[PDB]
């Protein structure tokens, strides 16, 4: 049933109790690693798309 | 994966020049798309985790 709380809601409770304000800081530290990787893959895929267009 | 917006205009000299300006611009709208599902196998439950789960089921009775 939808009444049962999802893992993300339980983790939300845990986070609140164990770190109210340090969660944002951890989001920022992990973001620095995720956005750089995803932007690298976005630019590589975008180059691939331009290349495939040129070959087309 | 951060999304790729559609090719604005065919043509590399002009349209793709402003498509790198747009997609890679300092100020942009990085929407997200998911990767296609990779066929994850089920993780084997450790035996101690099964002596934790089984002790609750015995507490039913």
Curated annotation (Swiss-Prot), chain A:
Lineage: Eukaryota, Metazoa, Chordata, Craniata, Vertebrata
Protein name (database record): E3 ubiquitin-protein ligase HUWE1
Subunit structure: Interacts with isoform p14ARF of CDKN2A which strongly inhibits HUWE1 ubiquitin ligase activity. Interacts with MYCN, POLB and CDC6. Interacts with isoform 2 of PA2G4. Interacts with NR1D1. Interacts with AMBRA1. Interacts with HAPSTR1. Interacts with HAPSTR2. In hepatocytes, interacts with PAQR3; the interaction promotes PPARA poylubiquitination and STUB1-mediated degradation.
Disease (UniProt): Intellectual developmental disorder, X-linked, syndromic, Turner type: An X-linked neurodevelopmental disorder with highly variable clinical manifestations. Common features consist of moderate to profound intellectual disability, delayed or absent speech, short stature with small hands and feet, and non-specific but recurrent dysmorphic facial features such as macrocephaly, microcephaly, a broad nasal tip, deep set eyes, epicanthic folds, short palpebral fissures and a short philtrum. Patients may manifest other features, such as hypotonia, seizures and delayed bone age.
Function description: E3 ubiquitin-protein ligase which mediates ubiquitination and subsequent proteasomal degradation of target proteins. Regulates apoptosis by catalyzing the polyubiquitination and degradation of MCL1. Mediates monoubiquitination of DNA polymerase beta (POLB) at 'Lys-41', 'Lys-61' and 'Lys-81', thereby playing a role in base-excision repair. Also ubiquitinates the p53/TP53 tumor suppressor and core histones including H1, H2A, H2B, H3 and H4. Ubiquitinates MFN2 to negatively regulate mitochondrial fusion in response to decreased stearoylation of TFRC.
Entry comment on modification after translation: Phosphorylated on tyrosine; phosphorylation is probably required for its ability to inhibit TP53 transactivation.
Superkingdom to which the source organism belongs: Eukaryota
Expressing tissues: Weakly expressed in heart, brain and placenta but not in other tissues. Expressed in a number of cell lines, predominantly in those from colorectal carcinomas.
Similarity remark: Belongs to the UPL family. TOM1/PTR1 subfamily.
Note on domains (UniProt): The HECT domain mediates inhibition of the transcriptional activity of p53.
Gene expressing this chain: HUWE1
Compartments where found: Cytoplasm; Nucleus; Mitochondrion
First-to-last residue of the parent protein present: 2641 to 2696 of 4374
From Swiss-Prot, chain B:
Disease named in the record: Intellectual developmental disorder, X-linked, syndromic, Turner type: An X-linked neurodevelopmental disorder with highly variable clinical manifestations. Common features consist of moderate to profound intellectual disability, delayed or absent speech, short stature with small hands and feet, and non-specific but recurrent dysmorphic facial features such as macrocephaly, microcephaly, a broad nasal tip, deep set eyes, epicanthic folds, short palpebral fissures and a short philtrum. Patients may manifest other features, such as hypotonia, seizures and delayed bone age.
Positions bearing Phosphoserine: 14
Family, similarity comment: Belongs to the UPL family. TOM1/PTR1 subfamily.
Written domain comment of the UniProt record: The HECT domain mediates inhibition of the transcriptional activity of p53.
Protein name: E3 ubiquitin-protein ligase HUWE1
Subcellular locations according to the entry: Cytoplasm; Nucleus; Mitochondrion
Subunit structure comment from the entry: Interacts with isoform p14ARF of CDKN2A which strongly inhibits HUWE1 ubiquitin ligase activity. Interacts with MYCN, POLB and CDC6. Interacts with isoform 2 of PA2G4. Interacts with NR1D1. Interacts with AMBRA1. Interacts with HAPSTR1. Interacts with HAPSTR2. In hepatocytes, interacts with PAQR3; the interaction promotes PPARA poylubiquitination and STUB1-mediated degradation.
Signal peptide boundaries: none
Taxonomy, superkingdom: Eukaryota
This protein's encoding gene: HUWE1
Lineage: Eukaryota, Metazoa, Chordata, Craniata, Vertebrata
Tissues expressed in: Weakly expressed in heart, brain and placenta but not in other tissues. Expressed in a number of cell lines, predominantly in those from colorectal carcinomas.
Function (record text): E3 ubiquitin-protein ligase which mediates ubiquitination and subsequent proteasomal degradation of target proteins. Regulates apoptosis by catalyzing the polyubiquitination and degradation of MCL1. Mediates monoubiquitination of DNA polymerase beta (POLB) at 'Lys-41', 'Lys-61' and 'Lys-81', thereby playing a role in base-excision repair. Also ubiquitinates the p53/TP53 tumor suppressor and core histones including H1, H2A, H2B, H3 and H4. Ubiquitinates MFN2 to negatively regulate mitochondrial fusion in response to decreased stearoylation of TFRC.
PTM statement from Swiss-Prot or TrEMBL: Phosphorylated on tyrosine; phosphorylation is probably required for its ability to inhibit TP53 transactivation.
Naturally occurring in which organism (per UniProt): Homo sapiens
């Amino acid at each position: 049933l939808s009444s049962i709380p999802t893992a993300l809601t339980r983790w939300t409770e845990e986070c609140k109790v164990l770190d109210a304000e340090s969660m944002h800081d951890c989001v920022s530290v992990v973001k620095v690693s995720i956005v750089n990787h995803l932007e690298f893959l976005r630019d590589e895929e975008l180059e691939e798309r331009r290349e495939k267009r040129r070959k087309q | 994966r951060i999304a790729l917006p559609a090719p604005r205009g065919s043509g590399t000299a002009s349209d793709d020049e402003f498509e790198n300006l747009r997609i890679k611009g300092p100020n942009a709208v990085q929407l997200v798309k998911t990767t296609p599902l990779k066929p994850s196998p089920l993780p084997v439950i450790p035996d101690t985790i099964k002596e934790v789960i089984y002790d609750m089921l015995n507490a039913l009775a």
